[PDB]
């Protein structure tokens, strides 16, 4: 219900270190948002989507981050891939909405924008809504690394190459996930 500078924010987080905003109870209207041509996608799960809000809910969480265009499809219940496995995981029973839009004009630079990162290697998948910003060296072989990076001992985060002349599938997209909490104590 102050969805203003969630979407407006000049500044968005890497997906591995995704941001979170807590939004409790006030006046929240989905009549313009849902139909805006300014978003490339906006899809709701567990909600009556094109029947919009007659929901009520106790808290709403807004998670925001940047990924590559062809990875937006991983921000959905039951998906797999580096992003859904190692970076941002939605639960199967997810209840909420996924909003994304092309941010090539903000987030890609002529030399490449190496500020946005994602986790490439992880010992196991994340549980739903977990956020892992650890940077232990990834042991890819059977020999321990002891914090060196040589061969089979990899820094776990990789940078996107965001480069403005690439096709739209390789371009950066800003994502906002709205989770509708509810629980049993309103």
């Amino acid at each position: 219900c102050p969805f203003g500078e969630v979407f407006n924010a000049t500044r968005f987080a890497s997906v591995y270190a995704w941001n979170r905003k807590r939004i409790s109870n006030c006046v929240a209207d989905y009549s313009v948002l849902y139909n805006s041509a300014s978003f490339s996608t906006f899809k709701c799960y567990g909600v009556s989507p094109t029947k919009l809000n007659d929901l009520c809910f106790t808290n709403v969480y807004a998670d925001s981050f940047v990924i590559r265009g062809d990875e937006v499809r991983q921000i959905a219940p039951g998906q797999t891939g580096k992003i859904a496995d190692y970076n941002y995981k939605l639960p199967d029973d997810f209840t909420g909405c996924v909003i994304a839009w092309n941010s090539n004009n903000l987030d890609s630079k002529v030399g490449g924008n190496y500020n946005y990162l994602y986790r490439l290697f992880r010992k196991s998948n994340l549980k739903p809504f977990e956020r892992d910003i650890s940077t232990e060296i990834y042991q890819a072989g059977s020999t321990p690394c002891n914090g060196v990076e040589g061969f089979n001992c990899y820094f776990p985060l990789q940078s996107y190459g965001f480069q403005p002349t690439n096709g739209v599938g390789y371009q950066p997209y800003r994502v906002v996930v709205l989770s509708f909490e509810l629980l049993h104590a309103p």
Partner: antibody
Amino acid sequence: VQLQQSGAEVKKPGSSVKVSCKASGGTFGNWSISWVRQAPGQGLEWMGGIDPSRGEATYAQKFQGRVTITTDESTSTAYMELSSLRSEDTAVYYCARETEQGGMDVWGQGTTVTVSS
Amino acid sequence: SYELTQPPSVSVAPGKTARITCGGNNIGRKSVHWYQQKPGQAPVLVVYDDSDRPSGIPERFSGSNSGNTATLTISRVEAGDEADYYCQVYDLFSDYVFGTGTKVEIKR
């Protein structure tokens, strides 16, 4: 900037074909490459594409598992390999440059592949 | 989006205005492209980013995109415009999608 494709191919069912696309702009630059096909009397069908400087290719859902797209850095040449060919892979195959706004810009001249016994 | 629907053909008298529609859910959120194709030739991009013309494409080709329909408009149609026309978008879940194609014929 311009795109030269290899010549026509005739293939038997079950075999594979490897088609090439050589950019005349000298080098691949910073732009993406898609492969598109069109069967006789039918429409255009995206098969996949690659960022030549990123080295990882992506593929349409169908075709996943029997198409491989690669690029030759030094020669400024893209490749599309389709295997386990079947009659209905008879088509003209195009490479094309992807645009910044979501389309395709420069098209190769097309490569006819006929699959038959 | 995912599927793009085009009429199989439009038939237009010479000098009149041809309108080729392209339907898709919320196509207005996508960047529509239009290609002209003649027999034995590669597609030629004629309108990009909903309404922009590449250099060398005649003034008479125009595009629009709003809501659930995109449209290619060809003013003062002449025989040189006889061809198949494809609309096309990038969808985040289906990748590059082409319409089924519309054949423009000159009415007579």
